UniProtKB/Swiss-Prot annotation, chains A, C, D:
It comes from Mus musculus (Mouse). The gene is Calm1. Changing residue 126 to A: Decreases interaction with SCN8A in the absence of calcium. The modification Phosphoserine is found at residues 80, 100. There is a cross-link at residue 20 (Glycyl lysine isopeptide (Lys-Gly) (interchain with G-Cter in ubiquitin)). This is Calmodulin-1.
Curated annotation (Swiss-Prot), chain B:
May be a homodimer, which associates with multiple calmodulin or myosin light chains. Interacts with RIPL2, the interaction is required for its role in dendrite formation. Interacts with MLPH. Interacts with SYTL4. Interacts with MYRIP. Interacts with RAB10; mediates the transport to the plasma membrane of SLC2A4/GLUT4 storage vesicles. Interacts with FMR1; this interaction occurs in association with polyribosome. Residues 1-17, 18-42 form the IQ domain. Belongs to the TRAFAC class myosin-kinesin ATPase superfamily. Myosin family. This is Unconventional myosin-Va. Detected in melanocytes. It comes from the Eukaryota. Processive actin-based motor that can move in large steps approximating the 36-nm pseudo-repeat of the actin filament. Can hydrolyze ATP in the presence of actin, which is essential for its function as a motor protein. Involved in melanosome transport. Also mediates the transport of vesicles to the plasma membrane. May also be required for some polarization process involved in dendrite formation.
Length: 145, 48, 145, 145
């Protein structure tokens, strides 16, 4: 039962990691870091526009209540399993839920705004990959939502 | 939407691992302090 | 119904510090301390769960055989150094060989199992640290081993 | 059996050393002295517990029957015969039964109720110490008995 006071307790926990002076405030510079640590998923430009709506300098601070405003703003605009499945499905050569591990690297590191060497190394160590073949993406839909 | 999802999940997984690692250290630290205070208690009772 | 004989001896050794009457029982508040004295490091949560397997009373006590026959149903597994050394290797992801005492203070206070300021000040005092605040986590583990 | 006439005579002689009027009262400062002169074995904090019933700052006065009332309960308490061995067991140098002189200075002058300089002299002369050294605790218990 989302956005009840229980869920706001872990939002205070994760916020307290970045309120290093301990006054109820965090910098704009880590706002994406805390939101994605809590597992809510904004894009880069979206986050930057949400920061620059608060300050044209971009370099500033946000108090705990208005951090909860920014969390609620993203929660109103949340994805779904079928919307994430659609994003993988345009790359499906067969139509069976599988995508090439070669073309996956092209999608991760050449197309779009891209994933870094660290993000690639971390994900590839857990995924255990040594090849370029077809691999199931319905797992990705479930596990990353 | 793919890049956003992967980047989000990696940060989610790293936060969960960080909190688990913190708890793992903190429980051991609080254990070492409990053992040091038990050591202090037996030594202070004994000397008295 | 019991732990193996060599562990009964160490449990009797520990329990002798917490009996206050010489009559084989302990007042309910001492229960967490005696358990952590064994070398095992249960969470606050594990100690709160364990009370539901014990059936304690605020108008009563826990006898030596009541405590031992609880442990004979289930006890916490043995905590060894390499678990804690791996936990430090989560934080030092780039392999620098050290951690800032200020970062360590903030994280150990304001996240997870949450050490109070009394607990954190004594924790920082028991560590080995280079002359500008760089904590030598390997040597700190060695001094507890 | 408690309180044959001769018991009261022996205990009243020990008290009559300290009263300088013959009115049946002493200063609270000498309460520990008369008690230990008869070989009764309380802690300083155990004397302090009683003194909170009678003294404004540690310079008051107290009757023979008040002293004898405290003594009457202390005379049913245990002789510390097991307790003193449990105490010395902690300060053994290597587990063969021998207390170290270094540990013994911390036991005399740091831990607990301590000892003052001119009565630490007494223990050094009792033990014949002119440098580094040790003492057997079963023999030393036998001597203090």
């Amino acid at each position: 039962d989302q956005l009840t006071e229980e869920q706001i307790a872990e939002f205070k926990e994760a916020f307290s990691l970045f309120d290093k002076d301990g006054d109820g405030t965090i910098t704009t510079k880590e706002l994406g870091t805390v939101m994605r640590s809590l597992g809510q998923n904004p894009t880069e430009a979206e986050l930057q526009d949400m920061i620059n709506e608060v300050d044209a300098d971009g370099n500033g601070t946000i108090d705990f209540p208005e951090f909860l405003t920014m969390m609620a703003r993203k929660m109103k605009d949340t994805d779904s399993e079928e919307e994430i499945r659609e994003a993988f499905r345009v790359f499906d050569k067969d139509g069976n839920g599988y995508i090439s591990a070669a073309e996956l690297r092209h999608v991760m590191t050449n197309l779009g705004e891209k994933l870094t060497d660290e993000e690639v190394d971390e994900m590839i160590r857990e995924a255990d990959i040594d090849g370029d073949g077809q691999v199931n993406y319905e797992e990705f839909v479930q596990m990353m939502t | 939407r793919i890049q956003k999802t992967i980047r989000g999940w990696l940060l989610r997984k790293r936060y969960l691992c960080m909190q688990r690692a913190a708890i793992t250290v903190q429980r051991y630290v609080r254990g070492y302090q409990a053992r040091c205070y038990a050591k202090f208690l037996r030594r202070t009772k004994a000397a008295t």
